[PDB]
Structures are given as structure tokens and as C-alpha cells.
Amino acid sequence: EDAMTVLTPLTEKDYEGLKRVLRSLQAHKMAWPFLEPVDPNDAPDYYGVIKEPMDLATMEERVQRRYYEKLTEFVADMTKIFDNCRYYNPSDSPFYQCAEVLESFFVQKLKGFKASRSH
Numbered sequence: 488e489d490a491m492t493v494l495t496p497l498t499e500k501d502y503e504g505l506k507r508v509l510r511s512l513q514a515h516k517m518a519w520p521f522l523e524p525v526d527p528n529d530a531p532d533y534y535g536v537i538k539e540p541m542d543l544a545t546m547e548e549r550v551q552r553r554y555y556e557k558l559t560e561f562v563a564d565m566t567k568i569f570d571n572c573r574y575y576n577p578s579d580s581p582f583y584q585c586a587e588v589l590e591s592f593f594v595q596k597l598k599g600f601k602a603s604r605s606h
């Protein structure tokens with residue numbers, strides 16, 4: 488990550504861009520497993536093996552409350568969603584596949600956001 492991503496405070500204009508990035512991910516066809524916290528009835532052992540869970544609704548709450556001070560902090564929460572998924576689930580599961588697709592999409596949108604900040 489470059490110096491702007493790590494050290495430049497998030498402005499109100501930056502926050503309008505983060506809201507747009509988040510809504511794009513929430514609208515994606517393969518986002519369904521990540522929209523809300525993992526249901527422990529669907530995965531009884533999940534909260535014993537994943538110590539820092541994360542999901543898109545928790546991120547939306549944090550964006551609305553202006554939790555994030557730097558872009559790096561927002562990227563870290565998003566990356567946690569995909570890393571948790573690839574660690575918990577086997578490489579041939581549909582959950583793992585959704586993580587691969589949605590992370591590629593996040594990177595495309597994130598590059599777009601970074602470009603709009605600087606120029």
C-alpha cells in the first residue's frame with residue numbers, strides 16, 4: 488500500500504466513495520454468504536475456529552458511524568471477510584469460490600476509488 492492509503496485521513500468525500508464501494512459489493516450476485524454474520528446453526532464450530540469474524544453488515548454499521556480513520560483500516564476489515572472464508576472452508580466448496588470472485592471484484596473497485604482520491 489502507498490503512503491496515501493496508509494496515512495491520509497479519510498475525508499467526507501472519501502466516505503461517499505467508501506459507501507459506493509460497499510453498496511457495489513452488497514449488490515454482487517456472489518455476496519450472499521457475506522451479507523450478515525455467519526449463522527452458528529449453519530456452522531456449529533465456526534466461532535470456535537474463527538477468532539475475528541467479519542461481515543458486510545458490520546462494515547456498513549462502521550461506515551455509517553465513521554469508525555475508519557485511514558483507508559488501510561477499511562481494507563483490513565474487507566480482507567478479513569475473505570481470509571476467514573478461505574481458512575474455514577475447503578478449496579472445493581461454493582463458499583471458497585464466492586470469496587475468490589468477490590475479492591477480485593473488490594480489488595477492481597478499490598483501484599477505482601484510489602484513482603479518484605488522487606486526481
Ligand SMILES: CC(=O)Nc1ccc(C(=O)Nn2cnnc2)cc1
Nearest residue numbers: 520521525526529530572575576582
Ligand atoms: C461465510 C461462511 O463461511 N459461511 C458458511 C460456511 C459454511 C457453512 C456450512 O458448513 N454449511 N453446512 C452445513 N452442513 N454442511 C454444510 C455455513 C456457512
